[PDB]
């Protein structure tokens, strides 16, 4: 196993810049990682307060007792016992996928491939973070490892759900990252506090055509619009 740690180009991730400019690594080496995490300082004040209280509890030496209580409570295990347990799992078990797990994984592969295709069209360039058939095998290995914890001789639907969730939380999240006329049209034609049902906006804009969903993503990130009611109602919530 290769566990690697790196900073982006420009050191801090530089969010408004393209990922293809922020990421040094070629798509060849990137594809060899089952999970790519892009880690960012969220700067959220509640989180920062929480981290500050935690880190103070580290430096004060409170954490020495806290970890021991957590271990004796059975909510945590030690370095030594975990080391032996990883060895035992690596020597006892090597699970297969059930047929149901196999189908869910296969359909998930075509789903994420479609997402990458449309994103490459929307950004009109090949993505730096890739999704390839090697990355299906990444989700397969993760599924098997998740079953390998409990020494289950087969992986099951639940393990595939967690494997898919982890891949979505890591490699997809790494991959995930004229309209100016249409947005001011929507601002003109939907005043504050009222709702346009989405499909009518789609018909009107088409009747003038993919600029619609870019406009909605921008206006939803801002306070001006709120996608109420299962996304059916475009609500001019803010300015």
């Amino acid at each position: 196993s290769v566990l690697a740690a790196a900073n982006p180009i420009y050191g801090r991730y530089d969010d408004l810049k393209s990922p293809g400019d922020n990421i040094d690594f070629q798509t060849t080496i990137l594809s060899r990682f089952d999970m790519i995490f892009i880690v960012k300082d969220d700067h959220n004040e509640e989180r920062d307060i929480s981290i500050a209280n935690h880190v103070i509890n580290i430096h004060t030496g409170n954490a020495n007792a806290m970890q021991n209580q957590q271990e004796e409570n059975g909510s945590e295990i030690s370095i030594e016992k975990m080391k032996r347990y990883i060895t035992y799992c690596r020597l006892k078990c090597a699970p297969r996928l059930s047929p149901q797990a196999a189908e869910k994984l296969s359909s998930n592969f075509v789903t994420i491939r479609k997402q990458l295709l449309i994103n490459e069209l929307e950004s009109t360039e090949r993505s730096s973070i890739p999704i390839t058939i090697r990355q299906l095998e990444a989700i397969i290995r993760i599924t098997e490892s998740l079953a390998k914890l409990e020494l289950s001789p087969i992986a099951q639907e639940r393990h595939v759900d967690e494997a898919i969730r982890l891949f979505q939380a890591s490699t997809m999240d790494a991959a995930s990252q004229e309209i100016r006329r249409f947005e001011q049209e929507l601002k003109r034609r939907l005043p504050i506090g009222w709702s346009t049902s989405y499909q009518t906006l789609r018909r009107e804009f088409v009747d003038t055509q993919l600029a619609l969903d870019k406009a909605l993503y921008a206006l939803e990130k801002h306070e001006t619009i709120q996608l109420r009611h299962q996304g059916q109602n475009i609500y001019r919530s803010g300015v």
Partner: protein, 494 residues
């Protein structure tokens, strides 16, 4: 009078060839059968009412104009001006505009009936018993009223002033001026300059008070000199009885010191710089003596009733040291002074040292002792006055009687509005959209187990907030003895 408005509107609607949504049997508009079905837009339209009321807390040595407003709704309907699916029908709106202009002109020509009618319109646009009631019309008028209040604030601020507070009945305005006698001219110029803009042609702009010096954190918690000094504090009500007089005393001392400093600075020529120095050392000596006395007497049956903390509506929190609650309250009021944060902060440090509490200790931080329970848009039919009433932060007299006139509100009407608010919030909980907990996209599908970005779904109204709302409802019901509301609360669990 709403019924007379119904028939008289129905005439001009059919005369303009609109299909009429008169409903005899039920409040909801007869749109055909569709009116009987739940709808997320319709339920939002019925459940929603809150003005985005502005409240810029602080200290103000400039004179502050306490501007009353009335005929705001009428002004919006007169001065107002498919793709939009909860906008009221623009044809019917144009009829209501022209008809309201007709009634208003006849009121200007001193038709008592037309005058009474235009006064009563504010009831009819809200009243569900109106034969031509429509939630879309109520909401269209309401959000236009909201936009108009924001534009009125824009107009006053565009004329160089600054808004302390604003709602649908009242605006408090910082003038960038220092003397009331200097400004009895300029204030009338200012208000005229607003009303002469066409957007506000019909407003009852009325300068109800002149504040020489103002301390303000919300309309239930302020003090100031008026042109003479008044003090009112929902803060005070939560201090144990021994300390409520003590709070008022030090508030008068604070006002006195601020005024001495203002007039001193003006004789020498944000003027509040150094006001703490006139009373800080007496206050510390006093607090030390009180702390000694509390150690002597808090446990004593001779005195404990004066240390017992009051149970009250919206009583937010448990508290262990009532003297510390007084000190927290005083320090918070003084920390409103944006000009002078440092001197107050250093004094606050030297006070908390008496308890050996650290300057930033979580216990020493001031959290508001009161939880709001606002019933939006209550109607005083005796004077057609629309007011939000807060059952916790308002005093009891302002709950059981109107503020502008002083007719009493009917008890059962009052309890019914609380039950309507309660059930509206329970429904708003059950009909909420779910939001992704790490990317804030809305849940659009019906059977996903989590968002495609791997984030778990969470409520847009988290369950904890609604538990807290039901808790303040039970508190209000117990305190005022609202038997109907209390039995409704009982029937939820049981």
């Amino acid at each position: 009078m709403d019924y007379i408005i119904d028939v008289l509107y129905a005439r001009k609607l059919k005369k303009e060839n609109i299909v009429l949504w008169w409903n005899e049997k039920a409040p909801l508009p007869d749109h055909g059968g569709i009116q009987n079905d739940f709808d997320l837009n319709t339920s939002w339209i019925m459940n929603d009412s809150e003005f985005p009321k502005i409240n810029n807390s602080g200290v103000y040595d400039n004179v502050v104009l306490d501007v009353g407003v009335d005929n705001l709704t009428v002004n919006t309907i007169l001065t107002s001006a498919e793709f939009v699916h909860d906008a009221f029908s623009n044809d019917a709106l144009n009829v209501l505009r022209g008809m309201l202009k007709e009634w208003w002109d006849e009121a200007l020509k001193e038709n008592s009936t037309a005058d009474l009618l235009v006064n009563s319109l504010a009831s009819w646009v809200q009243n569900p018993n109106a034969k031509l009631f429509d939630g879309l019309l109520r909401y269209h008028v309401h959000n236009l009223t909201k936009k108009a209040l924001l534009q009125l604030v824009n107009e006053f601020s565009a004329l160089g002033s600054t808004i302390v507070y604003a709602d649908r009945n009242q605006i408090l305005i910082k003038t960038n001026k220092y003397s009331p006698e200097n400004c009895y001219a300029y204030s009338q110029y200012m208000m005229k300059a607003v009303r002469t803009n066409p957007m506000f042609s019909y407003l009852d702009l009325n300068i109800k008070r002149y504040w020489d010096l103002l301390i303000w954190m919300d309309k239930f918690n302020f003090s100031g000199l008026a042109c003479t000094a008044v003090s009112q504090w929902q803060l005070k009500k939560f201090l144990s009885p021994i300390y409520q007089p003590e709070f008022e005393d030090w508030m008068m001392i604070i006002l006195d010191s601020m005024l001495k400093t203002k007039q001193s600075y003006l004789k020498l020529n944000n003027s509040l710089n150094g006001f703490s120095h006139l009373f800080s050392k007496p206050l510390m000596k006093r607090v030390k003596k009180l702390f000694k006395n509390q150690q002597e007497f808090i446990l004593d049956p001779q005195y404990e009733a004066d240390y017992v903390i009051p149970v009250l509506p919206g009583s937010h929190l448990n508290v262990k040291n009532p003297l510390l609650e007084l000190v927290k309250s005083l320090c918070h009021v003084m920390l409103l002074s944006k000009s002078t944060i440092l001197e107050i902060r250093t004094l606050r440090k030297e006070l908390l040292k008496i308890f050996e509490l650290r300057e930033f200790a979580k216990v020493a931080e001031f959290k508001d002792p009161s939880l709001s329970l606002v019933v939006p848009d209550f109607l005083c039919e005796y004077c057609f006055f629309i007011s939000d009433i807060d059952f916790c932060k308002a005093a009891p007299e302002s709950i059981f009687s109107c503020v502008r006139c002083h007719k009493a509100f009917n008890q059962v009407l009052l309890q019914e509005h609380l039950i309507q608010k309660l059930r509206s919030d329970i429904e708003s909980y059950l009909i909420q959209d779910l939001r992704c907990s790490r990317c804030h996209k809305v849940k659009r599908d019906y059977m996903s187990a989590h968002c495609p970005c791997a984030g778990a779904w969470e409520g847009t109204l988290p369950r904890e907030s609604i538990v807290q709302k039901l808790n303040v409802f039970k508190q209000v019901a117990k305190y005022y003895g609202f038997d109907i509301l209390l039995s409704c609360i009982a029937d939820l669990t049981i």
